[PDB]
Amino acid sequence: TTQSPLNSFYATGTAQAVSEPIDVESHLGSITPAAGAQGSDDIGYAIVWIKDQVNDVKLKVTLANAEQLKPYFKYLQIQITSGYETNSTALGNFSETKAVISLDNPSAVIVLDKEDIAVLYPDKTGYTNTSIWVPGEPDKIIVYNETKPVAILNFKAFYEAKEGMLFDSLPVIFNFQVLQVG
Amino acid sequence: VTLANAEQLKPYFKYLQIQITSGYETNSTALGNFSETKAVISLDNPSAVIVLDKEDIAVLYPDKTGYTNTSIWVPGEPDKIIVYNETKPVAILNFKAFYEAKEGMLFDSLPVIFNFQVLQVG
Amino acid sequence: TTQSPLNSFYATGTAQAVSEPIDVESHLGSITPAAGAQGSDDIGYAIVWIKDQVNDVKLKVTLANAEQLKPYFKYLQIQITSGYETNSTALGNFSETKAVISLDNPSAVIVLDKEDIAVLYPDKTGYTNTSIWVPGEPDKIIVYNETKPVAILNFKAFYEAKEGMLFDSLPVIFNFQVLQVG
Amino acid sequence: VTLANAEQLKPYFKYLQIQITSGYETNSTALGNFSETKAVISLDNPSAVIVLDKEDIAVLYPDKTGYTNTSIWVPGEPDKIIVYNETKPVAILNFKAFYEAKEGMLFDSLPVIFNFQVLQVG
Ligand SMILES: [Ca+2]
Ligand SMILES: [Ca+2]
Ligand SMILES: [Ca+2]
Ligand SMILES: [Ca+2]
Ligand SMILES: [Ca+2]
Ligand SMILES: [Ca+2]
Ligand SMILES: [Ca+2]
Ligand SMILES: [Ca+2]
Ligand SMILES: [Ca+2]
Ligand SMILES: [Ca+2]
């Protein structure tokens, strides 16, 4: 009569990847020395949000406009440190200098692992009503009573202005490139 | 059990493994709880042979002491009741995935398709 | 009827490595001589946290900006000693000079073994209420009543400033590279 | 017993050895405690043959002197009771790992898969 092939059984699911692994928002500052002066100053920070089930990040940070900056600076070095402060006392404070880039070595590889990524768990003992803020600046709160894996990169500059050069508004541009994610 | 669209899934995943376990939970205390991992398939080995025997098939007998007013539900999810006070031989296959998304690939709604083929019955 | 292959039995576990073997946080100081003077001064320390089931560490410490430092110094030598102080009297005090780097030999290999890594066990006789602090500076406590394998690297500088050279804020940069871990 | 995904585990481990011991603990004092290391598998020798005989299989007889109200549990973990006042022949295989993680490799959730194949039964 009818000979079934015994194949007409199926089960189906779906998959998606709708977001990039990281988001970067910048809060950098300015370098305002006199002509030919030597100094150092904190630039600011850059928030690196971490997305769904991302645990380790490998980045490459580059001084994109290093060639443009050369005729205005005798030397210019940017030091990037990963760190944050919190009231959690179960997560703790962190500080980790990761790279030093300059006009001669504009690129550097940075790795962010479990300690570089700060996470709060509001439904646990240690994370009752705890915040996360930029190191040394308690008024700039990043995360408050919610689970948002975040990394904070703090920028500090060491510079030598060129003798007699007067300039007004040239930008300092940093580019981030994701290399590996897990 | 075969991953029918494994070739389609390859350019979106660095690796993808599906683990299938037979198991259930019940209040019978005469049939008991069961758990049995049966196969692990992937994009390189899409097919696997699975055998379901007496313990993999859960049956209730409402007119007996041990099966008075007993249910059968998915392991770990008591609100999803499969069988209630009736004789219906049933097996539950639970799926778990281990995956590595490909770097930089953005995708929306591609399906994951599993095909079942009966080989022998008794 | 049915011929079983007798293969459908499985048991599964998981593995992860989510942290790098070491963490380095810096507390270095400054070198402030007169123009052309000869002297020596303690720079500071650098805390090296040890992670899960890590017992021996082989590092490479480099003076990253040695070329930049050359026109300001006739010579500059950095001596790194591993050591700590404690009240444990079951762990004891430690001191171990590990490397001497300079502008001509900027890199050196350092090995940290069981004695270089200080660990407390608060639930034992010898480690009741004991602390760990930087040698010679009792007010800088590193570990208190908890198990955190830590190594302390202390920096001391021997320098000769160049005659007549006036400089303000150039940085001294040390880079650490992990070679082997067990 | 085979390490099914040994090839997948290779780029994350310099070496990885799994030691399997058959053993159990009990209050029977007529069956006694048992411990028997049976195999050591690794990424280079993923498979090993294991034989379970009369001592590896623990059985209780609740209607006898020595097995009055006796339990069987995992060695060193008294809170995980396997069998209680009933006749259920059971063998317990305990797993211990010796591993060397690869230098600088960061990984999150890859699985370790063991496959069991029956060869002979009596
Ligand atoms: Ca100048
Ligand atoms: Ca100045
Ligand atoms: Ca992840
Ligand atoms: Ca990846
Ligand atoms: Ca048949
Ligand atoms: Ca001199
Ligand atoms: Ca002097
Ligand atoms: Ca170790
Ligand atoms: Ca190693
Ligand atoms: Ca036989």
Q: Is the dihedral of CA A87, A91, A92, A96 positive or negative?
A: negative
Instruction: Please give the structure tokens belonging to residue B69.
Output: 């007013």
**Which ligand has the nearest atom to the CA of C1?**
5
Of D29, D24, D23, which is closest to residue D64 (Cα–Cα)? D29
Nearest chain B alpha carbon to A7? B117
Question: Which three-class secondary structure state does DSSP give residue A178?
Answer: strand
Concatenated DSSP letters of A95-136? EEEEEEEESSS-EEEEEE-TTTSB---TTSSTTSS-EEE-TT
Beta-carbon separation of C181 and D103 below 8 A: yes
**Which letter does DSSP use for residue A65 in this model?**
T
Chain D nearest-CA distance from B48, in A, is 13
Question: Which three-class secondary structure state does DSSP give residue A142?
Answer: strand
Q: Judge contact between D33 and D26, C-beta under 8 A.
A: yes
How far apart, in whole angstroms, are the C-alpha atoms of residue C94 and residue C86? 9
Q: Judge contact between A24 and A137, C-beta under 8 A.
A: no
Cβ-Cβ contacts under 8 Å, C68 against chain A = 75
How far apart, in whole angstroms, are the C-alpha atoms of residue C142 and residue C160? 33
The torsion region of residue A12 among left (phi > 0), alpha (psi -120 to 50) and beta comes to beta
Chain A nearest-CA distance from B108, in A, is 5
Q: At a CB cut-off of 8 Å and minimum separation 6, what does C160 contact?
A: C36, C38, C73, C74, C75, C76
Q: At a CB cut-off of 8 Å and minimum separation 6, what does C132 contact?
A: C84, C85, C86, C88, C118, C120, C141, C142, C143, C144, C150
Q: Which of B34, B40, B51 to mutate to test the interface with C (most CBs of C within 10 A)?
A: B51
Cβ-Cβ contacts under 8 Å, D5 against chain B = 17, 40
Q: Judge contact between A54 and A22, C-beta under 8 A.
A: yes
CA–CA distances in Å: residue B2 to residues A128, B46, B68, C27, C39: 47, 5, 38, 58, 76
Q: Judge contact between C36 and C139, C-beta under 8 A.
A: no
- List C50's β-bridge partners, or say none: C22
Beta-carbon separation of A114 and C19 below 8 A: yes
Cβ pairs bridging A and D (under 8 Å): 10
Solving technique for this entry? cryo-EM
Of D37, D62, D34, which is closest to residue D50 (Cα–Cα)? D37
* CB-nearest partner of C10 from B38, B49, B122: B38
Residue D105 CA, ligand 2 centroid: distance in Å: 44
Concatenated DSSP letters of A78-102? EEEEEEEEES-SSS--EEEEEEEEE
**Which ligand has the nearest atom to the CA of D120?**
10
Q: How many CB atoms lie within 10 A of CB D102?
A: 14
Beta-carbon separation of A7 and B117 below 8 A: yes
**Which ligand has the nearest atom to the CA of C34?**
7
Token pair 């028997």: residue: D36
Neighbours of ion ligand 6 (CB under 5 A): C 36
Nearest chain C alpha carbon to B120? C2
Neighbours of ion ligand 10 (CB under 5 A): D 121
What's the distance, CA D18 to chain centroid? 10
The torsion region of residue B74 among left (phi > 0), alpha (psi -120 to 50) and beta comes to beta
Concatenated DSSP letters of chain C? -----S---EEEEEEEE-S-SEEEEEE-------TT-EEEEEEEEEEEEE-TT---EEEEEEETTHHHHGGGEEEEEEEEEEEEEES-SSS--EEEEEEEEESSS-EEEEEE-TTTSB---TTSSTTSS-EEE-TT-TT-EEEESS---EEEEEEEEEEEEPTT---------EEEEEEEE-
Chain B nearest-CA distance from C12, in A, is 9
Q: Judge contact between C149 and C54, C-beta under 8 A.
A: yes
**A141-144 and A131-133 strand pairing:** antiparallel
Question: Which three-class secondary structure state does DSSP give residue B19?
Answer: strand
CA–CA distances in Å: residue C4 to residues A162, B14, D117: 82, 33, 11
